[PDB]
Structure formats: structure tokens, C-alpha cells
Design a protein around this ligand. Structure first.
Ligand SMILES: [Mg+2]
Ligand SMILES: [Mg+2]
Ligand SMILES: [Mg+2]
Ligand SMILES: [Mg+2]
Ligand SMILES: [Mg+2]
Ligand SMILES: [Mg+2]
Ligand SMILES: [Mg+2]
Ligand SMILES: [Mg+2]
Ligand SMILES: [Mg+2]
Ligand SMILES: [Mg+2]
Ligand SMILES: [Mg+2]
Ligand SMILES: [Mg+2]
Ligand SMILES: [Mg+2]
Ligand SMILES: [Mg+2]
Ligand SMILES: [Mg+2]
Ligand SMILES: [Mg+2]
Ligand SMILES: [Mg+2]
Ligand SMILES: [Mg+2]
Ligand SMILES: [Mg+2]
Ligand SMILES: [Mg+2]
Ligand SMILES: [Mg+2]
Ligand SMILES: [Mg+2]
Ligand SMILES: [Mg+2]
Ligand SMILES: [Mg+2]
Lengths: 117, 201, 64, 143
RNA sequence: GCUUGACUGCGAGCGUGACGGCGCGAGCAGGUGCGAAAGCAGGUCAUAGUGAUCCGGUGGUUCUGAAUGGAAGGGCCAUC
RNA sequence: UAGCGGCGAGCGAACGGGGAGCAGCCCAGAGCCUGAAUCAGUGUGUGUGUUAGUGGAAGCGUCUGGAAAGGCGCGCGAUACAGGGUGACAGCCCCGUACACAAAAAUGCACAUGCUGUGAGCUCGAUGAGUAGGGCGGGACACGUGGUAUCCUGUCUGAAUAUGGGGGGACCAUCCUCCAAGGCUAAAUACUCCUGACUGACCGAUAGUGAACCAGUACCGUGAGGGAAAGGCGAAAAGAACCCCGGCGAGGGGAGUGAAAAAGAACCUGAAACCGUGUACGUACAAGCAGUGGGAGCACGCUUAGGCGUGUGACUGCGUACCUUUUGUAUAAUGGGUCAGCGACUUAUAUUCUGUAGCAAGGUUAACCGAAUAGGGGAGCCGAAGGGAAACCGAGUCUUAACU
């Protein structure tokens, strides 16, 4: 029972090459190079599912800081005031309000200031 | 146990040990597989690095050329000549314990009775060695794929069945495990039943 | 082919009832005047093979 | 019960190790041999009894005893065998006829193993003290 | 001063070694010395002073003894 | 296993048992006797086989299609539904197949006979000398000179002779058994250059022979010798009349053939590396394993948008390939120019353990026989008892004068 490897080998190689579309030069054409690139890409993606969470929180904090200082308080003190006032709105929502509803953000700041007093 | 005769409408007393035992699938499987293994003709061979035609001259010198070292033109790595583990003619037969063989037959026969695949008759014969005669007889009995087992092999019956692909005619001493399972229906004459009982005991 | 027995081993070890092997003690062939009687007396009877060495003995004696 | 319905019993057929067929298998690359050394080489490994160069155990210990040659032609008979002779008289010839001892056996001894429940006449065979009592209790005679 | 316990067969139980091994040991049987006796003695205050297996040698012992009776050779015990 | 063995690595019987197949004779001599079997050759006559051959059953309609053997619907043959071919898959179209037959001539075998060489039977004899054995040196025996029997003989010697001699594993006695120094002999056994038939959980063009093809060729070597690559148009050549550009070219465009010419001979299918033309988006102030996470704009679809889908991706966070070998590699340590095809834990026989199945104090047969995966065959092997170096004893036994 001799087994020829042609049909199966072709299918495996095409699978990897399909995932390498868009890559530069040999990275999207040659199997040896394409395989390494596909593996690397997956390794970055696993790491970046975690990094995405870090970067977005960092962005929200920066926007809250700016909006709060426009109302005359720093981010650090603003967060403390909300905690003392038992407000549980998270940073994702706070950053959204800071950009779209500036009146509502002012009301939040006043509540924080009252609690700190 | 009583096996009702289809033609005579009369019961035939048979042993419960042979026709009424439970079905041991694992036992039957082993015997069936061994039978197929015993039919294999293991005739094949390939050439090793020693049997390929060629000289034993070293293709090029060990050191100096920037080429991978070589020693033989018949190396299995090289095109033309090789086969690392070349096949040799081999025997695939397996040993079946005599008791295990007989036990498998009893299970098969008992299962046929439960599934209503065993038809017992007094006699089964044709007047002339004519295929047309046999075909009509089977059609009357609503049979197609059938293994006919007789006490004595009738020459006329044997001749009439040669050209019927789905019909096999055998004697009691010729039963084999695969045949009993392969055919849809098994027709046994009264005499055949008795011989089978004594054989299997 | 059939496994061959290490013949030297077959002359030094004998199988017992439960599957162990008995052997004769060493240090009782020559140079005996200097040895104490107590020491020599304890070497005379046959002894059993230790657990660590059983594997080696079994390999040498496949038909024991 | 059809040829495409029969199945083996669970546990009867294990697969079999296939070495050097990838990382996922668990036996890829080195194939369970580790790294380098004599034991990783094709056809490599030391002979039976080799312990490095240290004098091996089977050469460190002294040889003892001799083979008898008389033991080869001596057999022992159990009390259970006494009833298989078919005749009631247990002799060297009758035991051989019943395929109990062997054609070359010349001396035989009956020992207390099993039980005898039928009068038997043992002739020309040594009998142990325990066996003698058992045979006589069953109604036999040791000639 | 008197002596041969620098005894023979064994040995509960331990110590120490990968193993081959090595070490300590009350008590039991036989026979012994010293002491009035209880008792003590299986070498030396203790820890170095040594060499596996094979192949042979010497003495003892029918255990074996290739048709049988012997014998040769082998085994076992002591020893080189 | 018993043994042999720097008692190391290793080497390794026989007795006895089960089978296949079986067959016994002649000279060393003279009478009585004669062709008595038999074998060899040469005739003849039979039987059978080989080397050319002969006959050999039974189907149509309709649908799809280039074409029917396919679908559907009704029939028929079968001692023939082995196989092959035919414009796609045919028991009934063709060649066959089962079955039944056939030889002028040559020849094989088995017989019956003819002839020739032959020469039984009986009685009384006879019984293989430079030999057996020995000394020396070697070799062969499972047996390495060992306590070493037995066999062979290069060298030197050397008996007895049926009232005798050989062997029974040093050797001697007793007993048993056989008769060397002359020679024939079928079967069961080994093998395949070659011939025919049939088969394969054997290969299918880098496989299988080195060789599917004008291959032991081309080519290489003074020579011995070494030794390739290379298969497929179509059902049928129907293999492209004629016209046009061109050098009365190469090559191409029409026409025509065909189911198909993007089946056109550089011909089935026609992958990948590699090289082009066209379109969308990006790109000429921006520094690194070239991705990954976020993300504007543009193009094209969709949907009445609806932050949808596809392509591209300015700007920005993070980010030094893979394998191997190492205490440790982005390492300036090793390996790979790329693609496609091939390329490495197998097989046989023993032995032990685990799982699973059968049977169970029992289990199981090997060769072989066989109507052949049945059945027969229990020769054997393993287990149900151990202790002891062994004789031996035995649920005990060894140790010791004897064991608490
Ligand atoms: Mg050479
Ligand atoms: Mg090849
Ligand atoms: Mg059988
Ligand atoms: Mg000694
Ligand atoms: Mg692992
Ligand atoms: Mg390595
Ligand atoms: Mg290492
Ligand atoms: Mg290692
Ligand atoms: Mg037997
Ligand atoms: Mg015809
Ligand atoms: Mg003579
Ligand atoms: Mg002689
Ligand atoms: Mg001579
Ligand atoms: Mg003798
Ligand atoms: Mg080829
Ligand atoms: Mg091809
Ligand atoms: Mg032209
Ligand atoms: Mg083509
Ligand atoms: Mg640059
Ligand atoms: Mg280094
Ligand atoms: Mg690093
Ligand atoms: Mg590098
Ligand atoms: Mg560099
Ligand atoms: Mg390189």
C-alpha cells in the first residue's frame, strides 16, 4: 500500500498561504517564509488581545483628565470624589460623556467636589 | 429447542447449546477477522539498498567538494534505488483456538435463529441440472440471496447454481463463519442440521 | 531466533519458589587464614539477590 | 449481525507508537530517545549484564554445584493422578500409558498433593509418609 | 600465678553500603580454661596492616560415577 | 537443555519421541545348473498426453447525449454472469467462456508382446594387510588437550585373522552388541536460465527492472568497468482544401473538420516557484524581522443610509526570523536561493509485562494427513510443590551431633 503525498501536501500549503495574503514579497508567496510569518502574526494577536485592554483604559483616563481640568479639578481628585459619593460609572462611560455631553460631565464634577468638601 | 420446518410444518428438536446461546460479538469478530486474514496471498517485494543494480563506488570524495557527503548511489535518500524497509513476502495467517472457532459458530447460528434468517426444510433438490429450474424454485420460496446447505451435495443442484451469483450451494462440512453472516438467508435441510449438531456438539 | 542464555550466569544463580534467585557468597575461595571464623561462618550459607540487581540477573537468564 | 456491524471489544485493540511524526504527537524529533549518547544511536546500546567496566555481578560471584543427570529421569506423582491410570494398578508402565510422566522416566514417587478417593494398588513406586496414609485410608495397598 | 575462649555449630535484633560487601551483637547447643564463688573468656584500648572471579594445587568426605562393578573426572567441607 | 569456552564474547549436541518416504543386492568360487527374474537396447501393438484446430445459447422499444453498453419499460439464455473489445458502465453487438469434439505426421508416458546382451536356483566353500592399532605433527567431531573416548592422515612403524576382531566417551574386568580394511542401489530432499496457464489488502512513469520508449543504447573510460534521460491528440486523421501578412521563411489571423482545437501535433488534466499586461487604493521630509492592536480617507457593491460588506491603509502603541546546539543565541555560532516530487523507529523469530477474548486444575497442539481456514494428529510444551551442590526427602526440606 504505497501512499502518494501530493494531494494532501498541496492542501496544507494552500491553507497557510491563504492566511499570508497582504504580506510583503516572499512572505505572501513562498511557503517556508509564509509559515514563519503566519505563526508570528498569531503570537502578536494573542499578546494584543491583552494589550488592547491596557491601551483603551489609558486613552479614557487621558480624556477624563483633560475634561476634568476644564472644570477645575485633576483626574486623581475627581476619581476620589466619585468614590466618596458612591458613583460607580466606569471610565469607558465617563470618557464618552466627557466628549458628547459636556453639561452632564459638569454635573458629575460638581457631585465629586461636593463629596470632597 | 424446536425449529419449525417450513415445508413440513413440523418441528425439529435441536440442541439449546448450539442454537439457543447468546451472541458473543467480540468472539465472533475475532474469528471473522482471522478468516479474512487467512485468505491473503502475501506476494510482494521491494528492493533494499543492497538489491538495487549498481556499483559500490563512492560517488565523490569525502572532503573537498562543497557537496553533502555520499557513500552509495543506492542510498534510500537518492532518487532511483532505495526503499529503506523493503517488503518481503509474508504470511498473514492467525491461529484460532479450536474451542474459540466452534464457539463463534454457535453464536452465529443462534443469532440467525433469533433474526429469522435460518430456513429449515426436509429436502432441497432440482430435477435437472438447469439454472432456469433453480431460479423458479427460489422465486416460489421468496428467496434471492441465499446460502443453501445440504447433507449430501447433489450434482444437479451444484450445477444449476453455478451461474446464480447470489446463490451458494454447500455441504454441511463446508460451512465457514463469513458465509453464514454474508448471505441474507440460510436454507438448511433436516439432514444438514443433524450433521452440524454432531460437528459442533 | 530463540534467545540464548548467558551460560556464565546459569552457573551462579538458581531460581527459588517465589521467583527470587539464590547465589553463593564471595570472599571464600582463598586467603582464608587471616579471616575470622565468625566472618567465614556467615559466608558459607547461600544468599538471595538484592532488589537492585534482580533486573540484571533476569536479563541474563531468560529461561530460568 | 452483518459484516459492516461487527465490532471489537473495548480495550482489545491499542493503536501503537509512531515516532518522529510531529510535535503534536508527543514523539516527534528525537522520538523518545533523548539527546545524544550511545543509547540514541541506531543499533546502539550495551549488551546484557554490562555495568560499565565494573566487574559484572555474574562474574563477581562464584560458581557452585553440579548437574545430577539422575534427576532428569525422576518424576513426582500427585494423589490426584492416581485415578487417571484406568485399571486400578499404578505402575511405571501404566503411568506412561496415561501420559502422566514420560517415556524416559525410570523412577517415580507419590507425594501428598491433592486427594485420592478410590482404592488403588501402587507397585514399584516410592511413596511419602503422608501419601502412604492417604492411600491406605482410601482402601489401597502399597506393594 | 595458672592456662589456650587467638574454641566448633548457630544466632533475636541492629548499624553501614547502588551493589559485591563490611561491622556490632545478647542468647542457645557441645566441649574448655581461670576463680572459693557471683562471674569472665568466640584474640589484642578502639579505629589502618589489604585483593573479587576464573584456572589450578593439597587434605578430608562414596554426594556423583555415561551398559554394570570399580576407577578417572566432578561436587561439598577445610586450606594454598 | 547436556556440554564447550581468555568458563569471556560467544559456540552448542545427542539419546529418545512424532512424521514424509520406504527396497534391497553383488564380487572376492567351484560344482550341480542354464538362460528363471531383472535391467539395457532394439522392434511391434495398444491406451493416454503434447505439438495446428471445430461447433458453441439468448434483446428490443423509448429518454438524455457527439456517440448508449446509461435511465425508464417490457422480454429471453444460463453445466456459459472467467475475461477482453466495441464512440460513456453490455449475460443476450463482437471475440470468447461452460460444455462437446478433432491429427496426415512427429513425439512423451503407461502397458502388452517380439528379439538381442543378460543369467536364476541349489549344495559345499571362502570372508577385503603395509590394513586395524601405536609414536610424532596437524585437522574433524557442539567438545579450544583437557581426566578425553571416536574419526581422518603428512611422517616413522606395525598385528590378530571366527579358537579371531571392533565398539559401548580416560582406563580395567564382566556382560551386551556388531563384523572394517571391495562395490552397487529408486523414493521422500535442493534449485529455476527457460515454456504454458492462473493469482495478488504488489507498483503505476522521481514508483515498478538500470530499461513501459530501437537500453545495457546515448555518453564516459587505454582497459577491466561505469551508465542515463525519455510514456498519454482524437471515438475515428476526419492531421487543418482555400484566402491574407511575411523572405516562394519562421510565426500568426481567418475558413473548414470535430462533442471539444483555450484537443493543432512544443497536443489529456495542466498545480507551484518564476515573469508580464490591465484596474482600485497607497507611496518622492522619512530610519530597523516589515507584523500585530488602534485608525482616517478613497474606490466599488449593498441597503433607502444605517458607523454594513470587500479592497487599500496615511498616522500611531507594541515588536531583534526559523531550526539546531547549548549554562545561555537577534546573535557576527550551525543549516536552508525558491518551488514541486521523493526522503528516516521497520520486518522475522524468541522472551517478559499490560489490555482483551476462550476454556479452566487444567490449557494448547507442531510437523503431518486431509473431501484442505473444517476435521484428524496431544509427539511435545506450560501449570497444578518445594527444599537441597547432590544422593535423597517431601508440605516440608536444608543447615548441625541436635536446634530454643
Ligand atoms: Mg574498492
Ligand atoms: Mg527503484
Ligand atoms: Mg486444526
Ligand atoms: Mg574451596
Ligand atoms: Mg515531551
Ligand atoms: Mg540532535
Ligand atoms: Mg550531552
Ligand atoms: Mg541518553
Ligand atoms: Mg506425552
Ligand atoms: Mg456465442
Ligand atoms: Mg570383512
Ligand atoms: Mg578404530
Ligand atoms: Mg592410524
Ligand atoms: Mg562406559
Ligand atoms: Mg524508471
Ligand atoms: Mg504524470
Ligand atoms: Mg504556415
Ligand atoms: Mg494540454
Ligand atoms: Mg531604510
Ligand atoms: Mg559555549
Ligand atoms: Mg535574547
Ligand atoms: Mg545566523
Ligand atoms: Mg547580520
Ligand atoms: Mg548557508
Amino acid at each position: 500500500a504505497r501512499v502518494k503525498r501530493g494531494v494532501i501536501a498541496r492542501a496544507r500549503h494552500k491553507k497557510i498561504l491563504k492566511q499570508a495574503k497582504g504580506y510583503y514579497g516572499a512572505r505572501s508567496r513562498v511557503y517556508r517564509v509564509a509559515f514563519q510569518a503566519v505563526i508570528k502574526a498569531g503570537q502578536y494577536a494573542y499578546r494584543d488581545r491583552r494589550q488592547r485592554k491596557r491601551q483603551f483604559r489609558q486613552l479614557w483616563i487621558a480624556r477624563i483628565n483633560a475634561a476634568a481640568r476644564q472644570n477645575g479639578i485633576s483626574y486623581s481628585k475627581f476619581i476620589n470624589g466619585l468614590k466618596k459619593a458612591s458613583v460607580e460609572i466606569d471610565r469607558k462611560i465617563l470618557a464618552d460623556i466627557a466628549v458628547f455631553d459636556k453639561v452632564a460631565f459638569t454635573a458629575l464634577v460638581e457631585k465629586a467636589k461636593a463629596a470632597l468638601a | 429447542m424446536e425449529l419449525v420446518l417450513k415445508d413440513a410444518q413440523s418441528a425439529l428438536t435441536v440442541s439449546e447449546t448450539t442454537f439457543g446461546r447468546d451472541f458473543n460479538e467480540a468472539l465472533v469478530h475475532q474469528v471473522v477477522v482471522a478468516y479474512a486474514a487467512g485468505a491473503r496471498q502475501g506476494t510482494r517485494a521491494q528492493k533494499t539498498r543492497a538489491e538495487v543494480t549498481g556499483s559500490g563506488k563512492k560517488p565523490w570524495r569525502q572532503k573537498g567538494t562543497g557537496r553533502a557527503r555520499s557513500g552509495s548511489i543506492k542510498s534510500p535518500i537518492w532518487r532511483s534505488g532505495g526503499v529503506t524497509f523493503a517488503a518481503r513476502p509474508q504470511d498473514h495467517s492467525q491461529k484460532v483456538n479450536k474451542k474459540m472457532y466452534r464457539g463463534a459458530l454457535k453464536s452465529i447460528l443462534s443469532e440467525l435463529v433469533r433474526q429469522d434468517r435460518l430456513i429449515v426444510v426436509e429436502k432441497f433438490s432440482v430435477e435437472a441440472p438447469k439454472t432456469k429450474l433453480l431460479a423458479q424454485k427460489l422465486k416460489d420460496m421468496a428467496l434471492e440471496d441465499v446460502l443453501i446447505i445440504t447433507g449430501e451435495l447433489d450434482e444437479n443442484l451444484f450445477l444449476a447454481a453455478r451461474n446464480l451469483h447470489k446463490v451458494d450451494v454447500r455441504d454441511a462440512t463446508g460451512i465457514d463463519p463469513v458465509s453464514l453472516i454474508a448471505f441474507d438467508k440460510v436454507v438448511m435441510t433436516a439432514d444438514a442440521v443433524k450433521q452440524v449438531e454432531e460437528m459442533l456438539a | 531466533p530463540k534467545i540464548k542464555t548467558v551460560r556464565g550466569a546459569a552457573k551462579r544463580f538458581k531460581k527459588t519458589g517465589k521467583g527470587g534467585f539464590k547465589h553463593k557468597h564471595a570472599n571464600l575461595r582463598h586467603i582464608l587464614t587471616k579471616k575470622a571464623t565468625k566472618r567465614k561462618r556467615h559466608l558459607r550459607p547461600k544468599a538471595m539477590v538484592s532488589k537492585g540487581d534482580l533486573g540484571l540477573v533476569i536479563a541474563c537468564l531468560p529461561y530460568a | 449481525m452483518r459484516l459492516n456491524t461487527l465490532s471489537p471489544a473495548e480495550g482489545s485493540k491499542k493503536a501503537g507508537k509512531r515516532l518522529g511524526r510531529g510535535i503534536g504527537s508527543g514523539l516527534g524529533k528525537t522520538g523518545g530517545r533523548g539527546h545524544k549518547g550511545q543509547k540514541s544511536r541506531s543499533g546502539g546500546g550495551v549488551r546484557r549484564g554490562f555495568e560499565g567496566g565494573q566487574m559484572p555481578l555474574y562474574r563477581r560471584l562464584p560458581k557452585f554445584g553440579f548437574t545430577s543427570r539422575k534427576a532428569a529421569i525422576t518424576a513426582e506423582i500427585r494423589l490426584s493422578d492416581l485415578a487417571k491410570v484406568e485399571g486400578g494398578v499404578v505402575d511405571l508402565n501404566t503411568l506412561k500409558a496415561a501420559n502422566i510422566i514420560g517415556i524416559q522416566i525410570e523412577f517415580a514417587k507419590v507425594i501428598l498433593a491433592g486427594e485420592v478417593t478410590t482404592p488403588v494398588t501402587v507397585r514399584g513406586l516410592r511413596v511419602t509418609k503422608g501419601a502412604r496414609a492417604a492411600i491406605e485410608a482410601a482402601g489401597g495397598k502399597i506393594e
